[PDB]
Amino acid sequence: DKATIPSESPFAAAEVADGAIVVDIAKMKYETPELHVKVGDTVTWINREAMPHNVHFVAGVLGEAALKGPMMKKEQAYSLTFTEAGTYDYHCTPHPFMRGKVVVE
Amino acid sequence: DKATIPSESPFAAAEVADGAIVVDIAKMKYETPELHVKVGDTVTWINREAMPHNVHFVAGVLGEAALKGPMMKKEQAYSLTFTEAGTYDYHCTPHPFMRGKVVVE
Amino acid sequence: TDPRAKWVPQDNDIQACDYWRHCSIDGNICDCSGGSLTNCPPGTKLATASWVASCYNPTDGQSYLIAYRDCCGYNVSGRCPCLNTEGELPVYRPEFANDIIWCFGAEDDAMTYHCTISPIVGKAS
Amino acid sequence: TDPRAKWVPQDNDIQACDYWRHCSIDGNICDCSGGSLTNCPPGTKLATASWVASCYNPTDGQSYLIAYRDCCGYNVSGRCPCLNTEGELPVYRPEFANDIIWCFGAEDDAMTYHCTISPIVGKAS
Amino acid sequence: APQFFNIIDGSPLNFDDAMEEGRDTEAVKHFLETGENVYNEDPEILPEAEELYAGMCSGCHGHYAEGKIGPGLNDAYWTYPGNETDVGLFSTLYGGATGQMGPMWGSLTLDEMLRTMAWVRHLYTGDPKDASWLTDEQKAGFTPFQP
Amino acid sequence: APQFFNIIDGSPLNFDDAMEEGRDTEAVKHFLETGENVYNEDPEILPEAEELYAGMCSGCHGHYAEGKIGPGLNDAYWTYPGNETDVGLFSTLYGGATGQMGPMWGSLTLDEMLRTMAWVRHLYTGDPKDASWLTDEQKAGFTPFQP
Amino acid sequence: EAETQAQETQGQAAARAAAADLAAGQDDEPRILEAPAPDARRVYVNDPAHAAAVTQQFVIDGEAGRVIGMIDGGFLPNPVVADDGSFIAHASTVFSRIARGERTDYVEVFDPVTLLPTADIELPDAPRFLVGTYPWMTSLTPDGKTLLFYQFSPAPAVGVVDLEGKAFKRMLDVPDCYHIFPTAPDTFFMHCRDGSLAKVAFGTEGTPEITHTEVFHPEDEFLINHPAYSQKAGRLVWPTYTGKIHQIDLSSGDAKFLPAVEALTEAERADGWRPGGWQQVAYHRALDRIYLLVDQRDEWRHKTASRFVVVLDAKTGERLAKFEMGHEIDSINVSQDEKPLLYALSTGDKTLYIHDAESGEELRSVNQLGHGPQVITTADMG
Amino acid sequence: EAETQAQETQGQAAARAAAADLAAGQDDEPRILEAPAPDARRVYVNDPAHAAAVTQQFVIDGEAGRVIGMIDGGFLPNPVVADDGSFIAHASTVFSRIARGERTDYVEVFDPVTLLPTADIELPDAPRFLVGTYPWMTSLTPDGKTLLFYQFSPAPAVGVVDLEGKAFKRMLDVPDCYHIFPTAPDTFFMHCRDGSLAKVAFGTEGTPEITHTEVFHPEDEFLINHPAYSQKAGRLVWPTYTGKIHQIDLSSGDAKFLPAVEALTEAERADGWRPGGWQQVAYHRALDRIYLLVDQRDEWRHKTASRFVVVLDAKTGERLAKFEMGHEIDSINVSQDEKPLLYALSTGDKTLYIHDAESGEELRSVNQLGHGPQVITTADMG
């Protein structure tokens, strides 16, 4: 695969250490649409509003199968560690208009 | 393969050639249950009652596929020319209890 | 009306369950989904076999044998449902049983029930 | 009752269409086919995504965001149908549209609609 | 008296060809005069009638006239409608039908014909009420046949 | 006077690193003293402000600060809560954040920072009543930003 | 908007907990429920839906009058329930294009708690008999290891499905008989056109051994399509159009005809009383009682609903009670426990009325049971 | 049970005719009928059946108020009708085990007279958007040679199906826009999230050319999911929740925005009148008239049925009439002939009420139209 999952289920945002790579979700959008990280970094998405959101990578992007991430409720987080360089696009399952990408270098 | 259908659909009994081999159908049964004919003979079933009836030979008897003859209303006939020699069992589709047999010798 | 009361046939409306030729119909009247009293609706397959019943015609006082053939290859029409059992016999006497899906002989081996027609195939007792 | 009258929520019966958490539900109440207010019936698949709506709770005067997730992989239950549209928006604003079959994320990719649950996912405005 | 005609071509049956033995019986006289066959359901006759049917008819028509190589004779249906009456049944045997069912005025006496006929009516499986060839008293004692 | 600290390590901001030019303006004096940025929603300033944002921030934060390489700056959510205030926002520009967001004293004078911030506050797409950095006269005259 | 008193109490208790949970600070965490363990009061209601292409089965808790689950089915499926509650199954039929296209007959086995399918066994050459749902046209052998189904055309036959091995075995050639009443892992009885009963003993291979019993009913006596059969007791309760009841005891492995009984009294028959409906008979094993849906009706209206249920001692034929159901009932059945429930299903109301079998009093009801619910099935546990 | 005042008419005619055939000795010889030639008065009613796994469409002769045919369908199918009556089709969805198992999305084309399927085109990877039925979520191009359907997840797109060639062609990547209004064999418009219209010109291959129009409505103005579109006239009629009407002229191949018009009067909006239902708008090409389902209701009851229909001049916005439908109507439409019929469908009554568009008088009706009928489709012939 192109990434590993630290936590299969969402976890409390408060557990995200200061200084960690974070993409906040609020107002129906990924606050950082074009995130640039290095091979090996772990990205953590934190939903900041009541509206549930998740990250969804279609099949073939992070691996054979698509990665339909779990829905984060307010103050919940989800992480993904990228093990290979490249550009991986994603969107929010119920809100296709919500799109973002992670550039692994 | 083992028989030919002179007429696809049933026809009036009046058109039945006098002296022809005939199996009458009445009172829920084939009045001549064990008909004996010779290779090349054309047997003709004639329904004599209001209750509709037909002749049904399951797959493998008169050929690869089964022969589900058409329903005969009162005073209607249906014929079959037996080409190979052998015993050919048949029944009435809606009335599985109505059993018949044609011995070709 | 009373469902348990003796069946009283009429000869003035084929879309009503008390129409005389429907004395032993089970399902839906074809005339209500594009067919007619004796024809199948477009797209359906016409069965050859069926269950029968002797129905009394109040118009001429004669009884006729009705051949309840089904139009098949379609989901139940859902229009004009009727269930009558004049002379209807249990399944071990299939020739007169009407819970059976009489679709045998239909083109393309269609066996799904859509509706039933009420054609006369002869006079009865 | 009057279908066009303003919606009046209650907090004493979850099987009634006027139960407060159902202010924007579309389909059938899961509690009526083996599920519960917030759980799916046995044999069905639980979707992750859904449409939402802010529902007013007459009990505490607070408004909560309800996530209308569907239980899928089964034909419509046919029990307890309801259709409310408090704050419901057209399809071009999917996050609040309820004609959409919210089955995305369900196990085995089940996409058929069976019923809808009404769980609270947070407080609203 | 009844009309005795060949069931196929309608010509009068010629009783002059009948065997001389068995033309005198009281049953024959009564029958030729009234069209009624007194041997029907006749206890003192059936046993013999049965033997007659066994050797003379069972081979083609079946052990119980249910049908086999030939057509059934035990029900209300008759290819030749007149056979629902004994005058017609008799005419069938005496003058013959078609194919292998030809005239029997050479093999059976008039009396043997009526006896054999009785067994055929006895093998009837239809409703007694429909046994038009029977008197009321006989209808009352008739029971649909069963082996 | 408000306290100016680096938003990440909390060390005091060293104004000695500030450009010598543009420290004297009345805006800077007032801001440093009260923590108020008088350029907020100031029409005469908005044009230069937008240009200042264009050259220095749009590259990482997007043409309208909706977000890109860096997080969006146009809504109610802030990674660093203090940025909801102008003292906090300024502290972020002056001291920098983490990652690619470094200090800005080597690219903007003190006055230019306040003008740039004026534009960031201008791109705000929330309801006027939420702009806690705005004053009534500014609010009533303020309208959620739309391209 | 119409709720029954039972579902109203449930709906209220549910609101109560949800309100208290919220108030106590609990959070909603949606999951997939499991149905409660099957028990005596568990009852199944199958909806043939007037022969629609798709159908539904409702799994119900009779004690509470609550729907605890459902199972989807194809065209006119036949449901079966293991008496020991270890599993449930059915023989179904589907098409590649709703009601047209390639047909596929198959058998599915389900987990009684998760309702998940544990087996999907395809039947070769679409052999199922497509007819109004008759409980005994698809039956389970006493060991629950085999499922038997009837085939009408092109010839009378019964299919043998190995549930244990999850595989179709073979078709068994049978006389002109109908229905299947399993008495052993390799034996079952059928009812023949001639009025006799047929005993069919089949092995893993070879022609099955068939024998006939004496003809137990005249040709003008009509035995309904829905007789009651208790596999545990080996009792076959078969009513006629007039309410006359033929009881056959198969417990010994061979048919033993018991004294005929009359469900209706002389007075009632003289007043036009006759049985009527779909599942007209019910039989309680332990109590050895017979239940029959009856009413006053013309002789050819035998499939119409009935508003009364008479109960009689199956041994003495003695009348024990007569209940006024208060509704148009098409089918009945009972739970097999000590103080049984009397289930009365109305096809027209699409409602299951649950009564106390002793007093006949209506206890609760469950509505919205499909488009035309017709069959009630229960498990004889213990 | 009930028969419409037009059903009895047909039932009597058939009775009278059959009685005559019997009297004259004319024997019954059953055959498969063909539907009458599609005409201006032919109307289609699709029954989504409240999202059931299987559905039905009823072909109706609006003039006689008679059902002349039916067509089965899967899960939430999208129906289309060739304006020249040469054919009809739909995008459907089926599963291998009723509502579970492998999913298959496909397009079927039907002969309008025999109702026989002339094509079964499979859509790769189940791309259909499963949602309540919106007529314009699946559309036919002007030449009737291509069918376009919308895909919602995992990303907005529209599938191109070649009916002439009977094959799926490709999926088109589109912006976050919804609905499909074809204006040419290679062009169609869409409504976007930002309130603009999107123009999509697509070739046989390569990235489609996409352009946006100006934003024609404010963010807080909500446009219903059932706008009326006349492909022949190139007129798009899009109402808001308040009855405000946005008209877009697409004839020139480019969007031309017409003056907005208010379907409800100031007095009415003041008294709480608002449009409501499913297919809330109809548009008659020749007469250039707009029909809207309205009633008095709270603002968040926009999907409930209405009892009135107001008619107005599309060009001037002048109120021409206001009909009291006498029933709970969820959807309306009109025949496109000279003196059009006004179709009023009630999901609750499962009945189609046929009115005179000029007077608004109810002429006839057709009942028993499925479980929850919702979509009326007509062909603009000539």
Ligand code: HEC
């Ligand atoms: C085989 C050589 C036969 C023997 C021995 C008997 N019958 Fe026959 N019978 C035979 C045939 C092939 C037919 C059909 C004739 C036709 O033209 O259709 C018959 C017919 C009859 C009938 C007519 C029944 C009807 O349907 O109307 C009768 C009454 C009859 N046969 C009587 C009969 C008796 C009494 C016999 C023993 C003395 C007997 N048959 C012998 C062939 C043969």
Ligand code: HEC
């Ligand atoms: C790329 C080299 C950048 C340029 C040029 C600018 N910013 Fe930035 N900014 C960048 C990153 C990677 C981040 C995230 C920092 C973190 O620790 O998460 C930021 C963040 C900000 C913030 C914080 C917003 C919040 O949510 O708290 C602000 C207020 C900000 N940036 C402002 C800003 C201005 C005004 C700029 C132009 C002078 C500017 N940034 C340029 C990366 C980059």
Ligand SMILES: [Cu+2]
């Ligand atoms: Cu989202």
Ligand SMILES: [Cu+2]
């Ligand atoms: Cu027959």
Ligand code: NA
């Ligand atoms: Na005969």
Ligand code: NA
């Ligand atoms: Na932000």
